Amino acid sequence: SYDIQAWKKQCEELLNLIFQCEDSEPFRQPVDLLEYPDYRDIIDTPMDFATVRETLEAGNYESPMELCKDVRLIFSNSKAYTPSKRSRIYSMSLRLSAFFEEHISSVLSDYKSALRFHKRN
Numbered sequence: 001s002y003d004i005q006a007w008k009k010q011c012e013e014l015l016n017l018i019f020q021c022e023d024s025e026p027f028r029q030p031v032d033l034l035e036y037p038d039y040r041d042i043i044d045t046p047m048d049f050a051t052v053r054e055t056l057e058a059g060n061y062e063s064p065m066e067l068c069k070d071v072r073l074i075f076s077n078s079k080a081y082t083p084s085k086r087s088r089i090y091s092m093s094l095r096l097s098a099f100f101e102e103h104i105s106s107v108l109s110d111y112k113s114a115l116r117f118h119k120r121n
C-alpha cells in the first residue's frame, strides 16, 4: 500500500473521530486566558484540535509526523498545566492520547513504508 498522499485523508478521518469523543471537548479550541489567567506563564506554545484541522486543510503539514508532533503538544500542554494527576481535564487528555496513539500508529507506518518504496531504486 504505497500511496505517499494517503495519510492526509486518514488524519482527517481520525480528527473527525476525536471531535465525536466527549473527551476532546476541552481541547477542541484554543484555551481562553480570561478563565485561565496564568496559562501563558506556564505554556509557551498553545495548541488545540481546531488549529491542527485548519493546518491540515490549509496544506501546511508536509507529513503525518508533523501533525503527530502538534497533537502530542496538546497533551504535553495539558500535563504541564495540570495542578494534579487526578484532575478532570488531564484525565480526559490521557484517555484521548491513548486513543490517538492507537489510531496514528498505522498512519505513520504506512507513510514511512510508502516513502521507502518511492526511493527503492
Ligand SMILES: O=C(NCc1cccs1)N1CCN(C(=O)c2cccs2)CC1
Residues within 6 Å of the ligand: 025, 026, 027, 029, 030, 031, 032, 035, 036, 077, 078, 079, 081, 082, 083, 087, 089, 090
Ligand atoms: O479552557 C481550556 N480549553 C478550552 C475549553 C475548556 C472546556 C471547554 S472549551 N482548557 C483546556 C486545556 N487546559 C488543561 O489542559 C488543563 C486544565 C486543568 C488541568 S489541565 C486548560 C483549560
